[PDB]
Design a binder for this molecule. Structure first.
Ligand SMILES: CC(C)CN(C[C@@H](O)[C@H](Cc1ccccc1)NC(=O)O[C@H]1CO[C@H]2OCC[C@H]21)S(=O)(=O)c1ccc(N)cc1
Lengths: 99, 99
């Protein structure tokens, strides 16, 4: 699809058997989701945003479907005000900016 | 141009007679720049990011050139760890997501 930016680029994703909504966020290096349960090992990570540093849990090689496209990659989980799909997963579904 | 997302989508902008770099950020409603001087009236505004609420100054109808495209729009100024061009200005230069 071609998504214009008059509205937030929110799409439906499926992960760990749940349907959630998330932001396609080219300003994010990494995908970060609101608190949820994921299986397997995780390591503590820190990220920075507007507001400062935030502590998160990193899970790797997590299957996720994004607006109909299936992907596998790293997912961070923590106290984000928004589910965001960052560049690490946007590249997996062939997402680009165009103008 | 078509910009892939293996790297941060950083472009050169010109604003208040300065050249700066900024991130094309579909996950931002609003354009937010690191501390700088702009002419005219400004109102205090609050935004939220990953690390909480942040107080910023809002300036309206500011000319800005972004990767060669001229635009006019609202610019927020405050303690952001990055210059970010948000949807309010991405729409002005005809920027879309495609996958
Ligand atoms: C500031 C950027 C370098 C990075 N941010 C991504 C950014 O797109 C966030 C993404 C975002 C979105 C909503 C809430 C928090 C963070 N947007 C944001 O801070 O924008 C603010 C300015 O305009 C407003 O519109 C939306 C929030 C406001 S970030 O959320 O802090 C971030 C940092 C690292 C990762 N891996 C993921 C996300």
């Amino acid at each position: 699809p071609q998504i214009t930016l008059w509205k937030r680029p929110i799409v439906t994703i499926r992960i760990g058997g749940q349907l959630k909504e998330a932001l396609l966020d080219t300003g994010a290096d990494d995908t970060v989701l609101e608190e949820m349960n994921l299986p397997g090992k995780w390591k503590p990570k820190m990220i920075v945003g507007i507001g400062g540093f935030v502590k998160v849990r990193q899970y790797d090689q997590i299957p996720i479907e994004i607006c109909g496209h299936k992907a596998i990659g790293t997912v961070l989980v923590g106290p984000t005000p928004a589910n965001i799909i960052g560049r690490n997963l946007l590249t997996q579904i062939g997402c680009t900016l165009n103008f």
